[PDB]
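Continuing the series of single-chain predictions for the mutant panel. This is the parent chain; the variants come on the following pages.
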Amino acid sequence: DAVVGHSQGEIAAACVSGALSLEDAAKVVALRSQAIAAELSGRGGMASVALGEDDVVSRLVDGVEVAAVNGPSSVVIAGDAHALDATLEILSGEGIRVRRVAVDYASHTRHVEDIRDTLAETLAGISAQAPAVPFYSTVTSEWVRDAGVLDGGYWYRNLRNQVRFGAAATALLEQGHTVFVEVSAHPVTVQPLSELTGDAIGTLRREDGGLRRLLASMGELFVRGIDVDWTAMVPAAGWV
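Parent structure:
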């Protein structure tokens, strides 16, 4: 009924939602990942401060901007490494649970304002068709129902401007959406979503990326209430 994601998590959230062709989505993601590797590395990092937007912004130092609004009680910060170290020392002095994440590239900050023309050149005219499944956008916080509009400009803007995940999730909850199926190799968006709605199922986990975890996630989705076609996994046999 909809597919949601965060930044890079919005790539295939636009691919299988009827808003991207497979080949051009592959082109987009290859260019994005190579651009991230080439330039953004060694220019910052993410630190999760286990507080909401107001609490973290009351303590935000210069040079660091809120990475995204992930929830009224969970907001990550991103900025220059020295300011991150100072803010983390201050937070530890305050005793608030704060956790770095080993990211060498500062994402969705001022650093993105330098290679914008590169993304514009590389992502010009990508076949991002009109979504047969309408994804409520997060850059502008409204449903997009046009064909060919979603070019590399909004992709760069998602890569640059702060993502309003909390507002988008609240709007989706208020518009009747309840089931949030988190699909990745390890849960990252489950915690915030679950603290907001209490219904979140992750697909894979660390060290358990085999078939068994896939069937477990499918079973969780099936027991949640949605119907799944189990006949594909198991073929026919004799009478028992």
